[PDB]
Symmetry: C4
Subunit: 325 residues, 4 copies
């Protein structure tokens, strides 16, 4: 048994990667989009709250400092000056809130007594506008543009290698839950092996192909109802020599690919799966999915992941039939 070396659909990559050079640095150099991917709904709101609240507290503190520096402290008696109608540090609170949130309560109005105040408040306003633009841009970017949803495609696990049209074939079918059929639906079949070269060397992992009809052009299936993609057996095929004990006591991963174009959005969907050692039940044909009605046709998934029996099949190897000249 192996039960690894595949994408995380069944089992998985099993503790991905190992200690190496890494080179996955400068995360915050371009974290504009990665953070929006990672932050998630859990604490984005509090991130914005804390960032922008500290943003106006810094400026409120500097207004408080300049108010202490100039104006009232020079002469508290009479002294027509700035910080009118407000006092202390609550003055800084209210001024910062009114100016940042563009609220016009009008209790405090700066004047010619503080010529630096106009420059200070205009710089504050432009910085606040920039920060608001950043916030709204981030919220827009996370909400609408990405679409992480691809589960409407499903690969039936149970599969069969058996008789068909006078020859042998191993088959697999796909299903969908809703409408909006795919466009340019490819299909592939790859087999995981371990080999030793003729010169002599241990190759740990090897990829070999299964001819599902790439050169015949029968791969672009128009999928509205489940269909069983098959593979005829021949001497060119790498599986012409397999027995029951051979298939049962040896492990090979038939990884499958159904990369497809979902409707509308330009997200290239792609699904992966494999059958490890025993999911292929020899001599177990498939059942009809017919749900015919007098008026038109529909179907439900009340018979998936099962099989009908066949008692009369050549219980032998693929080349055994070729032996019978």
């Amino acid at each position: 048994q192996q039960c690894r070396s595949r994408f995380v659909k069944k089992d998985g990559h099993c503790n991905v990667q190992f200690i190496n050079v890494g080179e996955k640095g400068q995360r915050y150099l371009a974290d504009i989009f990665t953070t929006c991917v990672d932050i998630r709904w859990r604490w984005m709101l509090v991130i914005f709250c804390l960032a922008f609240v500290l943003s106006w507290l810094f400026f409120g503190c500097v207004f408080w400092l300049i108010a202490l520096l100039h104006g009232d402290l020079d002469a508290s008696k009479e002294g027509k000056a700035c910080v009118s109608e407000v006092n202390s540090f609550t003055a800084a609170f209210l001024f910062s809130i009114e100016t940042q949130t563009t609220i016009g309560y009008g209790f405090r109005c700066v004047t010619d007594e503080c010529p630096i105040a106009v420059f200070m408040v205009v710089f504050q306003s432009i910085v606040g506008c920039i920060i608001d633009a950043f916030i709204i841009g981030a919220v827009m970017a996370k909400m609408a543009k990405p679409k992480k949803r691809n589960e409407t495609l499903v690969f039936s696990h149970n599969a069969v290698i058996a008789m068909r049209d006078g020859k042998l074939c191993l088959m697999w079918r796909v299903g969908n839950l809703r409408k909006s059929h795919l466009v340019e639906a490819h299909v592939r079949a790859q087999l995981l092996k371990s080999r030793i070269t003729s010169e002599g060397e241990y190759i740990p992992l090897d990829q070999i192909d299964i001819n599902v009809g790439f050169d015949s052009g029968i791969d672009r299936i128009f999928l509205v109802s489940p269909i069983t993609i098959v593979h005829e057996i021949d001497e060119d095929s790498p599986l012409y020599d397999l027995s029951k004990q051979d298939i049962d006591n040896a492990d090979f991963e038939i990884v499958v690919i159904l990369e497809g174009m979902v409707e509308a959005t330009a997200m290239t969907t792609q699904c992966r799966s494999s059958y490890l050692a025993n999911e292929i039940l020899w001599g177990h044909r498939y059942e009809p999915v017919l749900f015919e009605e007098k008026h038109y046709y529909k179907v439900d998934y009340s018979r998936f992941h099962k099989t009908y029996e066949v008692p009369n099949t050549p219980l032998c190897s693929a080349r055994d039939l070729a032996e019978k000249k």
Copy 2:
């Protein structure tokens, strides 16, 4: 009289009965929720949500104001949020503050630390739901949905003589000037078969070689062109009689795939011909509008054909025998 898997265009029968796995959120409350609520009721839902936000905030301010300074009225009363004597005062205060309106008729005074705390929280709330609503209304101008406008198939298809053999033919019609990039084309035959071992297979799909290996499938489409399918030994329509053609045992589905300019939408088109639109003989009337500098076409006669005087009926391998 069969299933007719062809989708909405032309004949239409596609659906599913039982429900699998659906949920984890309204439907997305992310983007499909905005998709389904197009035009109707989305403005109503969000505007009622926002006005209920004002109602909640103003109710809280009214409660805190009546708790704080309403008890000692008619005796000085230098409490916070002055100029309040009823619910309407605090309600309109919330209206101004959340709409960042600076009327100034309202007041906040000092020594009311809870008031400023709630003011900053409600300001943040107003800002964040303003961002949410602007992002939501943005999505209306995000996905352009179209299934027409320089892409359509033909209501008429026919099998007829042509140089070499009989051929199934079909054209694709257009509306405007715009062209198509990577124009695929495919034909599939749906029928029923029985395995030699013996078992009922009502559903079987076979391919029609329109020249996938020969490379004649990417058509530069500016005027309608009749894609044709030759007849050979590999084809399943090698020799069938008139009873076969007027019988209903096969269905021809035709599929086109393209990408309109200045967009990333993989447009797909599907059409059907069961047993009746295909006719024996006949020929398409040419679009013969070759004139001076005035270059024109007209699809007024697009869906029509005429009849050949005399044509062979069977032929096939008659020369060898």
Copy 3:
């Protein structure tokens, strides 16, 4: 003979009657915003929004005069502290829609309908602002549809190479950006009559440049020539030099390509007309070596010279016969 059907070389096509299925339902916003393209839409929308301002000003003025004709001043104040009905209401609407809190007038508790009405106008104003800002964002962010940076050549360069006849065409890229998944095609347009004796005004034939062999996906950083070897499968296998000059066959080339950092599939069309032909010509070695540096220069791109010696109509005859 002159019914050209391309776009970038010369000529075009037009449509008449065509059933008129391309009728706008005004349900499309992106196309409407694209069509104007910064010409007059800013003016259209600013006048739309200021007429909304005037509508609101008029309705506030009407309600004010409704209350104004009742109290007639010299009473317990009013809902709005103003005397000039039109100007005060207009400025009130302006400042409220712009969130300006000048506060020269008041609100009072005598007009709850005024509170309801200002709530509705604030909602309408925020929705309209969101709509306009979203439209501007959608139009500006979506690119201008450049569709350039790839250029074709002038005339067919039918000549000899490696002892065989061949047509060649080069491609220029003035910028530095490269292409991904660059296809290449070549279609010949002509007129044909079938063996049965019927007229086909327009017929397309393919000119393979490497399909089914893999040599069509060029990695384009230096201007490279694409050539078509002459074989039996080629249509113009052997024919006189005078007739091809008299002939009006049209060669159209397609260089579908993907430009970096986008999702738009570019495509280019060219014009090679048979009325002018340069038989037996060869281009210039654009590649120049600069010791430590390498370069090419497009000053001689649209130029070719003549080989002093070249076989004429070197067919199977006189080479095997």
Copy 4:
């Protein structure tokens, strides 16, 4: 030794194109290109200066209309359209209030100035217009991903190997991050300068390397770094090369691995080559994807290294072809 790729992507290292200006002039006529060229180095200052110059222009025009008509013409009587301002700073601050929609109640306008209301409604309109322009400009960079990533990478060291009774030009490709690719092409192109049959010096030209385009083994499903075979044959143009021929001569093997990043719309691809000596005769590759006892973990520490094969034939392809018979 002319070429187009030295060791790595963007390895042109030459002069920019000259004598062409047909469609490379109107750089500023576009907005997206201007946003792409500019970065956060100076954008803050650009927006700041634009919007503050709008401020100054509006303040100046309000001050000019105040001089034209108002209270300063006849200082007596309170009949004026501003209850304040008789100074540049006050008018500027009023312009700031109007632009940033603060809402200070310190000043207002009188009904006898229809110009004033016309001016301020145009003021609000243009304020909204430039606010929308700024927010869209700042949005453009945040949402659309423009940074280039290098999750996939080639191998520095490549070898020519005597494997499976034939000869190959072995090379493998590594993936840094865990993410996978969709529709993974692979190509190999030889750059050379030749002379035609009649005797003309052909400039730089490209020839193809048959990695299995027709056999269909090019769409590799990449979760473990896998080598690429070539299976040198008589049809290949590398047959006549000998042991010293590769060293004395030179040739550029450009490799492209066009791929699709997960859940996006970018057709990423990478370019690399080997000049004349990076290819080592014989040699093999260590099991970089070494099996770990529990499950699969892979270390790339030994990625760019090779193991010296004890004994392999050292001759040309024609030599082995003739030695066979």
